[PDB]
Amino acid sequence: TCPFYKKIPGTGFTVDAFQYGVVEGCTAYFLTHFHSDHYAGLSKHFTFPVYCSEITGNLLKNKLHVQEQYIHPLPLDTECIVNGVKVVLLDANHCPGAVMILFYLPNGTVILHTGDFRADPSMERSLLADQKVHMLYLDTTYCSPEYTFPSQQEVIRFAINTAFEAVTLNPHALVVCGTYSIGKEKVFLAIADVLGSKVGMSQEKYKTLQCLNIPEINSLITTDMCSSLVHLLPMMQINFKGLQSHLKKCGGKYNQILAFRPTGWTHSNKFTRIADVIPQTKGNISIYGIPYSEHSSYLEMKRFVQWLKPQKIIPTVNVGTWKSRSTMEKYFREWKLEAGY
């Protein structure tokens, strides 16, 4: 049974609600992005209309085999009528193809559903500038002040400089980057660019990357592992045992691994600047945890909401405990009293 925070009142619509069977009264199912917690339930046997971005539509067809007749891609930044209701999709600054959805209800109410997002001041000059929002369905993943992390640009700067130093000191070092979903592609693409290499990966990951409309992608990635000095591996293999085993397979081409685990926030964020980050090392293997986030920091979230001034907020993350829900409601009230809406 579908929870209230995935239904859009006054419409036949749901958001990210594929794991509940046939939802009573749903005429169109929106999908914000291709992350498994959100698509959980879709497959080739699905027979209702799915509305999404072009990129999400490429992934549904090629990776999940949803039939073409049920995939409805919409352009971004464009007023569209769906089952008699005006909607707009906006870039969520999350993973490739991720959107926020603006719904203009027939009674005059305006609702924004952020999906998963990383708030940015650039959003203050989208189509959001032009009108009032009554209800905000908000990605509250990091809604507490202890959640700090650097910009994505500082993080990439750290990674490029680290990789370029190591491989210049030792031309026989291999760089490995972990992955388990779409998103965070800048980590491995930026490192391979500085090194003059394509990125090597499995056929399954190549296939996923080929759905993402990244410009000049054929110039950037490959399934030929031997030709590449930046490899991608599943996130679960990014440990001393998994990396040892990988280096064996490379046929004595390399004698050192430098590996990156992009994480979200970790408690080492509460003490250490990005500049000061050090790896875990065993022998000729070193592993860096780097805090590359595709969700809002607390401060970015607070800025966005204080600018938007919604009349009501409905959290979509951390909703399962009373302590979480109480904490989030307290911050929403501070923000509102501080800004005056």
CA separation for the pair 262, 284 (Å, rounded)? 20
| Shortest separation between residue 190's beta carbon and Ni ion, angstroms | 21
Q: Which is nearer to Ni ion, 35 or 205 (CB)?
A: 35
Would you state the structure tokens that stand for residue 178, as one six-digit string? 């972990």
Residue 32 or 162 with smaller CB distance to Ni ion: 32
For the CB of residue 84, give the shortest distance to Ni ion in the complex, in Å.
29
35 versus 118: smaller Cβ distance to Ni ion: 35
200 contacts 230 by C-beta, under 8 angstroms:
yes
Q: Which secondary structure element, helix H or strand E, spans residue 200, and what is its range?
A: strand 199-200
Structure tokens at 31: 């999908």
Cβ contact 319:166 at 8 Å: no
Question: Given the complex with Ni ion, which of 254 and 265 has the nearer CB atom?
Answer: 265
Shortest spacing between CB 250 and Ni ion, in angstroms: 33
Q: Please identify, using beta-carbon distances, which residue of 116 and 185 lies nearer to Ni ion.
A: 116
**CB of 100 or CB of 195, closer to Ni ion:** 100
CB of 35 to Ni ion, least distance (A): 4
Taking the complex as a whole, how short is the minimal distance between the CB of residue 21 and Ni ion, in angstroms? 23
**Residue indicated by tokens 């007749």:** 69
Residue that is written with structure tokens 């959001």 in the block = 128
**Cβ contacts of 181 within 8 Å, gap of 6 or more:** 35, 36, 95
Minimum gap (Å) between residue 140 Cβ and Ni ion: 13
The candidate with the shortest Cα–Cα distance to 201, out of 216, 215, 180, is: 180
Residue 94 C-beta: closest distance to Ni ion, Å = 6
Distance (Å, whole) CA 253 – CA 204 = 24
Residues contacting residue 47 through CB under 8 Å, at least 6 positions apart: 70
> Under the rule (CB under 5 A), what is the footprint of Ni ion?
35, 116
Nearer to Ni ion, 99 or 230 (CB): 99
According to DSSP, the residues that pair with 91 across neighbouring strands are 99
End-to-end CA distance of the chain: 35
Q: Min. distance of Cβ 33 from Ni ion in angstroms?
A: 6
Nearer to Ni ion, 63 or 157 (CB): 63
CA distances from 38 to 15, 19, 42 (A): 9, 9, 10
Q: Could you give the CA distance from residue 241 to residue 246 in angstroms, rounded to a whole number? A: 9
